[PDB]
Design a protein around this ligand. Structure first.
Ligand SMILES: [Zn+2]
Lengths: 302, 74
């Protein structure tokens, strides 16, 4: 008998939106209203990448842009290696019929021995996005790299620094000064590949996939513009994986369709009992009151 | 016995041989390499050429430090 539930703050009492809109900020309330309006109307452009430190909001790169970057990466031949292969082994394929393309797969060694594919870390040069995709769905980790002039270095941070399954991991280009691949030796846990510990060893500060949405709620006393910025709590759908799977993309399509069924009246809309926080934003000596949605998630909808 | 065949063999190479192997299973080194799959969200992100796409200024989401200090009260 309510479409979204609070995950905390259930001792509070419901505040009407007319009372909130004239109140001082910051303050935290408990509301329940109906979703009259929301942006974007096109949900595929709701997934962005928040940098947890510098609070950078940016777009998840396009897949076609990813496909071009790796297609362009196929060039000449690598830097081989050197007495450097103490951390990893290697195997260079020569391709026929592709302008002399020669990929370089490098297998990270666990304490000196090589592991199984389910706990291995791959290092590719000149791979194509599709070949990157299928490598990721059988191996544990795939880090696309290039041959620097001394040691293997990462790509431009437009391309992910880590790929495990359907999750591409991006580092913030503005607050992450890189360390090169041979700093992965510093890991004490070289069987479990924690993206946070790979990013830390590389000096990469990772971005966060978060759904960014704007809601126009209405409880009958006034409408409110509540922002929704969350990673994997609200929809119970991880924003890290959503752009790589029909089933999760489809599932958030129908959840918004039950919040706001387009085609019928708002009389038959379900209530959204949310917990919001108000705060003061400044754009000069401008001063707005705006509201973020917290501690809320859908219930019984999978 | 192939179960036991693997035991009496150099672990280095069964690990070595099974790694470069699923890896060459994934590469398309024979001619034109294939085209990656697209899900219906990715295919329509490449045709949102009109307006400004939905994105909020990070000013409106980054809660101030001094208003967040207030927010952990009561
Ligand atoms: Zn940053």
């Amino acid at each position: 008998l309510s479409a979204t539930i609070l995950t905390d703050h259930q001792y509070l009492e419901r505040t009407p939106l007319c009372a909130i809109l004239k109140q001082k900020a910051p303050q935290q309330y408990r509301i329940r209203a109906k979703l009259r309006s929301y942006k974007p109307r096109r949900l595929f452009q709701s997934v962005k990448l928040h940098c947890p430190k510098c609070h950078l909001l940016q777009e998840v790169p396009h897949e076609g842009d990813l496909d071009i970057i790796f297609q362009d990466g196929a060039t000449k031949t690598p830097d081989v290696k050197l007495q450097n292969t103490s951390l990893y082994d290697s195997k260079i394929w020569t391709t026929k019929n592709q302008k002399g393309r020669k990929v370089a797969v490098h297998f990270v060694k666990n304490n000196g021995i090589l592991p199984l594919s389910n706990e291995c870390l791959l290092l590719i040069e000149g791979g194509t996005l599709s070949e990157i995709c299928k490598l990721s769905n059988k191996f544990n980790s795939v880090i696309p790299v290039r041959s620097g002039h001394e040691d293997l270095e990462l790509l431009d941070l437009s391309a992910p620094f880590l790929i495990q399954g359907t999750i591409h991991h991006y580092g913030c280009k503005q607050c992450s000064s890189l360390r090169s691949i041979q700093n992965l030796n510093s890991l004490v846990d070289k069987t479990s590949w924690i993206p946070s510990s790979v990013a830390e060893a590389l000096g990469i500060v990772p971005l966060q996939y978060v759904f960014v949405m704007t809601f126009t709620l209405d409880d009958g006393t006034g409408v409110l513009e509540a922002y929704l910025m969350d990673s994997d709590k609200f929809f119970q759908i991880p924003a890290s994986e959503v752009l790589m799977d029909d089933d999760l993309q489809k599932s958030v399509d129908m959840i918004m369709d039950m919040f706001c069924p387009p085609g019928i009246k708002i009389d038959a809309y379900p209530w959204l009992e949310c917990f919001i926080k108000s705060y003061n934003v400044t754009n000069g000596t401008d001063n707005q009151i705006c509201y973020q949605i917290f501690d809320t998630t859908v219930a019984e909808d999978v | 016995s192939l179960s036991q065949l693997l035991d009496e063999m150099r672990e280095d190479q069964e690990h070595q041989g099974a790694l470069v192997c699923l890896a060459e299973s994934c590469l398309t080194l024979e001619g034109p390499c294939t085209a990656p799959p697209v899900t219906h969200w990715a295919a329509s992100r490449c045709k949102a050429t009109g307006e400004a796409v939905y994105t909020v200024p990070s000013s409106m989401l980054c809660i101030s430090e001094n208003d967040q200090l207030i927010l952990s009260s009561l």
